[PDB]
Design a protein around this ligand. Sequence first.
Ligand SMILES: *[B@]([O])([C][N]S(=O)(=O)C1=[C][C]=C(C2=NN=N[N]2)[C]=[C]1)OP([O])([O])=O
Length: 355
Amino acid sequence: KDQEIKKLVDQNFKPLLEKYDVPGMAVGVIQNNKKYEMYYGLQSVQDKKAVNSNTIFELGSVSKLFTATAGGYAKNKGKISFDDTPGKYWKELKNTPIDQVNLLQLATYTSGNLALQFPDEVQTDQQVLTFFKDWKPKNPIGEYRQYSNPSIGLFGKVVALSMNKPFDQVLEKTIFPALGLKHSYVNVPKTQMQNYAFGYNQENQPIRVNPGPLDAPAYGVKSTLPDMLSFIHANLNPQKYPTDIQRAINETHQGRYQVNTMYQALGWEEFSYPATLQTLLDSNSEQIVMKPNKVTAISKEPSVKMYHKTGSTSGFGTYVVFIPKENIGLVMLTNKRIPNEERIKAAYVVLNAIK
Ligand SMILES: *[B@]([O])([C][N]S(=O)(=O)C1=[C][C]=C(C2=NN=N[N]2)[C]=[C]1)OP([O])([O])=O
């Protein structure tokens, strides 16, 4: 039955490469503290270079899981409180309307007036500040979820301030080493550049992620399959990790509110396990991801939880899912974006099939 993991991944993930003309894929499963790595295709088409365990992929919004973790770590070191407001850490925002939004609300997208992206004209340090100064409320604060790069991006920048280090150094010098990660970066160094995949766009042109305002906390991490698998292992089995990072991790698992069947935890999305396929699919529906939705308090506290997160940049897809009580998880990394539904559906069949 260990011998079936490979066959399951070939049945469910492998056809997506022909169907979506994807150059390269890495799929990892972890089960009962045993890791399985499946690699497909090429990290770079023009160089005929294979996907392998050194291959670095862009994680996109799976990056928000690291930001959430950095938030949990800073809360439990007493550097921040989730009841604080950003003006306490970014002086220049004190007494402004955005300083009525607390850090949890920023992290969990409920400021009530923040869209998916910054405006394209917002780019520099000063334009970012200016944007947050000029910010004014729209929906009642804390009542409306709209998925948002600037919201969690500011939470990220506040966490770095509370730690007196820029955000990239928070991850690379504190958070990634505490998790045992060897090849995860906000900035891929010179000596690893030959391991960094090209991404491929919808016209199969090789591309990489562009700079943008507060990109690191929102979508700027790159990692390998083994690293991601270690991250899922941390999440599934955090007793082995330093106390500090354990408390951080636990903090990311606590659901804060519900949108019907989807609970919003810190970074992660949480569901009752077992979740139906449609529950997992509808979590990244146009309605949930693209438009405001009024949240409610958690009514049904799930006893057995599962967690997932999707991520995309223009050239890369990512999906990450784990279920504590089954001691199982999966990671998919592609260097071409494929529909979220496909990633979700393939992971559902594999994880169900293994028990
Ligand atoms: B995350 O992956 C955020 N998705 S996004 O639509 O906001 C997005 C951010 C950044 C890029 C990009 N910048 N430079 N190159 N590519 C593209 C898209 O959430 P998710 O999983 O997509 O819902």
